[PDB]
Amino acid sequence: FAAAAGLXAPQXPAPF
Ligand code: NA
């Protein structure tokens, strides 16, 4: 779970 958040996180801005 922790890993999931951290690996996803830098892509969160892509649409914004
Ligand atoms: Na990115």
Tell me the C-alpha distance between 1 and 13, whole Å: 20
CA–centroid distance, residue 11 to ligand 1 (Å): 4
Tell me the C-alpha distance between 16 and 13, whole Å: 5
Which residues have CB atoms below 5 A from the ion given as ligand 1? Answer: 10-11
Tell me the C-alpha distance between 12 and 10, whole Å: 6
CA–centroid distance, residue 13 to ligand 1 (Å): 7
CA–centroid distance, residue 15 to ligand 1 (Å): 10
Residue 12, phi then psi, degrees to nearest 5: -55, -35
DSSP annotation string for 1-16: -HHHHHHHGGGTTTT-
Tell me the C-alpha distance between 14 and 16, whole Å: 6
CA 8-14-3 angle, 5° bins = 5
Method: X-ray
Tell me the C-alpha distance between 6 and 12, whole Å: 11
Structure tokens at 12: 């969160």
Tell me the C-alpha distance between 3 and 16, whole Å: 23
Structure tokens at 9: 């996180």
